[PDB]
């Protein structure tokens, strides 16, 4: 129902999944999709193809709200960041600026132990 012209895309790309969330500014969610929601169960959730599929679904869902230009933020060292950002242009939005917002501690908490695989 609500109409907004400028939006923000969030690509949370981990090593096990990728979540593409489309919101307006001031961070109110409008549409989202994940690789788990399109089959791709188990380990296949991390493939770039699944990220592209999720990004297409999210862009088409947001087209109903009617966005034409958006700003993209990618966080996480996932294998699907490039596919997720590419699929939005294929859908038809205008990417005003796309950036990386991964968090880095300034020597804070202690990470878990190393795997002896």
């Amino acid at each position: 129902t609500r109409t907004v012209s400028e939006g923000v895309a969030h690509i949370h790309a981990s090593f096990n999944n990728t979540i593409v969330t489309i919101t307006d500014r001031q961070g109110n969610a409008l549409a989202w999709a994940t690789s788990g929601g399109q089959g791709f169960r188990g380990s296949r959730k991390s493939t770039p193809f699944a990220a592209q599929v999720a990004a297409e679904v999210a862009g088409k869902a947001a087209l109903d709200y009617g966005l034409k230009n958006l700003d993209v933020l990618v966080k996480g060292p996932g294998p699907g960041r490039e596919s997720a950002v590419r699929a939005l242009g294929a859908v038809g939005y205008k990417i005003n600026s796309i950036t990386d917002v991964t968090p880095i501690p300034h020597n804070g908490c202690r990470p878990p132990k190393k795997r002896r695989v």
């Binding site: 996480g76 060292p77 490039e82 950002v85 590419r86 939005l88 242009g89 294929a90 990417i95 005003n96 600026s97 796309i98 950036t99 990386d100 991964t102 880095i104 501690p105 202690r110 990470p111 878990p112 132990k113 190393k114 795997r115």
Partner: protein, 62 residues
């Protein structure tokens, strides 16, 4: 903060952003944050890196 100008394509934007992130080296810190490295291992790795650096400098000098 890769801000695109008027008319670059999406692929050009992606590749330029990838180059910017490669220059920034955030992914190295993210990988380092996955598991805890003990001070012994850290000192050993840095000593090996220093030795390799000094070996490289002499080769580039000659």
């Amino acid at each position: 903060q890769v801000k695109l100008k008027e008319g670059e394509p999406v692929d050009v934007a992606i590749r330029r952003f990838k180059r910017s992130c490669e220059k920034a080296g955030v992914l190295a810190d993210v990988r380092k944050r996955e598991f805890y490295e003990k001070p012994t291992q850290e000192r050993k790795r840095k000593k090996a890196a220093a030795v390799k650096r000094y070996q490289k400098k002499l080769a580039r000098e000659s």
